[PDB]
Write a protein that binds this DNA or RNA. Structure first.
Ligand code: CL
Ligand code: CL
Ligand code: CL
Ligand code: CL
Ligand code: CL
Ligand code: CL
Ligand code: CL
Ligand code: K
Ligand code: K
Ligand code: MG
Ligand code: MG
Ligand code: MG
Ligand code: MG
Ligand code: MG
Ligand code: MG
Lengths: 226, 226
RNA sequence: AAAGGUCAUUCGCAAGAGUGGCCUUUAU
RNA sequence: AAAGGUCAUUCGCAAGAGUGGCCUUUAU
């Protein structure tokens, strides 16, 4: 790995590795080598879940376990990890196989998010739980300072079905009416039928559930609930 | 709290609380008080999954993240926590409401398993991460020394469907043929129809998926696969 | 958090290593 | 890991606090 890139990353992360081989392995995707970051990712995911649980427990003494669960999901889900990866410019540091280099793997959300978790595993093994907890809390400071509990942490599909279920109304139906693209790069169009609306609401996305979420968001607005 | 009970538990756990009020809250089920252990359970669950991940990562350097994930599930699932709760005789320390005391709540697996997680949260808040990690590793020493990776950690339903899918055979049909008892205390009977087997295989349990697992277990044996 | 199947797809003579969509199963 | 609905059910005059089965949704 090129030390020009690795030294910049260590500066941005706030952590200089004693064992550079741990950092190299954390940055190595399985397309590049049989010695890759998948075990580190498993370990780092578990550290992250604990650090964020502890942070929410202390920051929000009056909220119940449901609130903390939804807040933690917002913070540790793949989309948020990918955001952090882009903030660290992590794509420049990934060790990828040739197939990935030629297909945009350095921008691939799943690989970026996995590598954030693997870096946490690596920093932990290079130091200790106290050190990596402080590092994660630094990375998350702005998000933890801005997050708030309540139904704003509930996704649109959840909010819509609870709105309907609480009024003994039928659950919405979601139907794929159109798929455009090739089997590996699709755009879905969903039509959502909702009790009380005369027309289906439309949502689009690169997966069916992303399109359903977009459709549920539209239904909530058309129902004048938000 | 009654010192006789508290003193025995602390000897069993291997840990004496500095703040007894944390211990009381950890032992308090929501049937008993509005100040109960649910937030502590959320926190303790996250600590336990980190501690076990770290232990498996170090004890099994050659296994992949799939092996570690299944092994962790075996160790942290509700049935294992309830086992530990029985070993700590936790039922005797639970603080329950009158409805629970009169319906056997001190034996309810969900409540017992939750309280193990809540106590982990409480020890953590009473000390620090390194202390609670040491304690959990003491509690799990015999289980960690005995556990082994491989297909043995896959449940019967998973094993059966992978056998059939890998041979492009139909997945099993799990038919509920009988549900005996009241709606809150039932026995399910499942008939599982498996390609290659003459007659359906029978499973029973207190939940439909428990009955399905029992039937899958029988189907694997009759297929002479195990 | 993982598993399996399937359709497609990047690299590769291949061997083989990946990625996306969909389905099924398990744990938290 | 949590949420909601439902069918039962423990305690309770009730208010209210639980528990089990089933379904739906979300995250890991
Ligand atoms: Cl620079
Ligand atoms: Cl609060
Ligand atoms: Cl942040
Ligand atoms: Cl679809
Ligand atoms: Cl090993
Ligand atoms: Cl007990
Ligand atoms: Cl059923
Ligand atoms: K696939
Ligand atoms: K229920
Ligand atoms: Mg994760
Ligand atoms: Mg992960
Ligand atoms: Mg748990
Ligand atoms: Mg729990
Ligand atoms: Mg994963
Ligand atoms: Mg739970």
């Amino acid at each position: 790995m090129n030390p020009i890139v690795i030294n910049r990353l260590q500066r941005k992360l706030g952590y200089t590795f004693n064992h550079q081989e741990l950092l190299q392995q954390a940055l190595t995707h399985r397309s590049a080598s049989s010695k890759h970051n998948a075990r580190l990712e498993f370990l780092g995911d578990s550290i992250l879940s604990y650090v964020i649980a502890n942070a929410l427990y202390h920051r929000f003494p009056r909220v119940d376990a449901g609130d903390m669960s939804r807040m933690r999901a917002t913070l540790v889900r793949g989309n948020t990890l990918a955001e952090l990866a882009r903030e660290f410019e992590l794509g420049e540091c990934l060790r990828l196989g040739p197939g990935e280099l030629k297909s945009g793997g350095f921008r691939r959300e799943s690989i970026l998010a996995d590598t954030v978790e693997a870096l946490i595993g690596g920093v932990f093994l290079d130091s200790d739980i106290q050190t990596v907890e402080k590092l994660i809390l630094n990375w998350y400071q702005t998000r933890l300072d801005e997050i708030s509990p309540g139904d704003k942490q509930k996704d649109p599909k959840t909010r819509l079905q609870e709105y309907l279920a609480g009024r003994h109304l039928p659950l919405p139906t979601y139907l794929v009416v159109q798929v455009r693209g090739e089997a590996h790069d699709q755009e879905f169009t969903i039509h959502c039928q909702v009790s009380g609306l005369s027309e289906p609401v439309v949502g689009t996305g690169s997966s069916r559930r992303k399109a359903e979420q977009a459709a549920a968001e539209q239904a909530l607005k058309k129902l004048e609930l938000e």
